[PDB]
Structure 1
Amino acid sequence: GSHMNLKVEFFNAGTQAQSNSIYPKFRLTNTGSNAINLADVKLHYYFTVDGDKAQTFWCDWSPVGSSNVTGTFVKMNPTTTGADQYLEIAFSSAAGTLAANTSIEVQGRFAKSDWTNYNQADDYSFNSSATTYTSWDKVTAYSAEGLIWGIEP
């Protein structure tokens, strides 16, 4: 009612269909009056891997400190349209809190261990058009309560 006032905006920094990396950019805004503990916030980006390989996420920049933002990869089960995996982004306790009426960006990249290609065009979360942050319901966010933003595939 006031405990999940996290607005999520998104765009892709690189929008090549055949791409050796995926470039998720999130902007998270606390739209309410109470602080949000980032350690409990998770984000998902859903995609089809187009050849499974070890993958790595890097956070290149966030005001909370990029080393405090990490990513892991999980398989969808069952797979569905546009989604056989998701990236899950998490924040450490050192990321701190997101104050009332403030926002942070989370900018990063992921790639396969052998740098082989993805097809971005079929990915559930991919936005082929946005060049700026946009309120995007095809990425999801979570608190300790579970889902707080978006539509899971």
Structure 2
Amino acid sequence: MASISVQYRAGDGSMNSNQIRPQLQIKNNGNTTVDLKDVTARYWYKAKNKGQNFDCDYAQIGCGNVTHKFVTLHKPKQGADTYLELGFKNGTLAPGASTGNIQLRLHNDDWSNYAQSGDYSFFKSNTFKTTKKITLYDQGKLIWGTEPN
């Protein structure tokens, strides 16, 4: 399988703000290329039955090349009742290459504050960290990380 992983950190100050601010990178750790069009990422969290809204503020690969959708889970899980799924229109990663930064913001329809501490894919961190809690897929097959249970 493709060997890719996600580096992430929450945007500073975002935790109890009115925005979820995932900062992500996807790196190809393997010895094969990766076609990003086949790759999706899922950021799992509790939207708590509030309508969700997406912005891409900047991506090294170009925000216009990033796709998104929100998916409500059948029923809530620990740490998640929704995921944001990211996809890509194009782009490849050679072995060792990274997407570079993908800087996103999510907000509730009513711009109310989130309380993100319990969100499966959320954590505060001083720097980008590898995380197993943002999952990656190759044509929909899980290839990085662990989904909430």
User: Do both proteins adopt the same fold according to a TM-score greater than 0.5, normalized to the shorter chain?
Assistant: yes
Alignment of 1:42-57 (within 5 A): 42-53=40-51, 55-57=52-54
Question: What residue in structure 2 maps to residue 111 of structure 1?
Answer: 107
CA distance in 2, matches of 1:146, 1:121: 28
Alignment of 1:43-122 (within 5 A): 43-53=41-51, 55-93=52-90, 96-104=91-99, 105-122=101-118
Q: 1:42 to 1:20 in 2, by over 3 A?
A: same
Q: Contact 2:65–2:88 at 8 Å: present in 1 too? A: yes
Q: Contact 1:12–1:131 at 8 Å: present in 2 too? A: no
Give the percent of matched residue pairs that are identical in Structure 1 and Structure 2.
37
State the one-letter code of the partner of 1:65.
G
Deviations 1:94-150 (A, max 9, x none): xx211221112222111123212211111111103x121111111111112610111
What do you get for the CA RMSD once the two structures are aligned?
1.5
Instruction: Measure how far apart 1:89 and its partner are.
Output: 0.7
CA distance in 2, matches of 1:83, 1:21: 16
- Structure 1 residue 124 and structure 2 residue 124: aligned? no
State the one-letter code of the partner of 1:92.
K
Match of 1:7, SS state, is strand
State the number of aligned residues.
147
Q: Contact 1:60–1:107 at 8 Å: present in 2 too? A: yes
Unaligned 5+ runs, structure 1: none
State the one-letter code of the partner of 2:113.
N
Unaligned 5+ runs, structure 2: none
Match of 1:71, SS state, is strand
State the one-letter code of the partner of 1:135.
T
Worse-matched range after superposition: 12-21 or 140-149: 12-21
Q: Contact 2:46–2:80 at 8 Å: present in 1 too? A: yes
Question: What residue in structure 2 maps to residue 14 of structure 1?
Answer: 12
Instruction: Measure how far apart 1:81 and its partner are.
Output: 1.1
TM-score by length of 2: 0.90
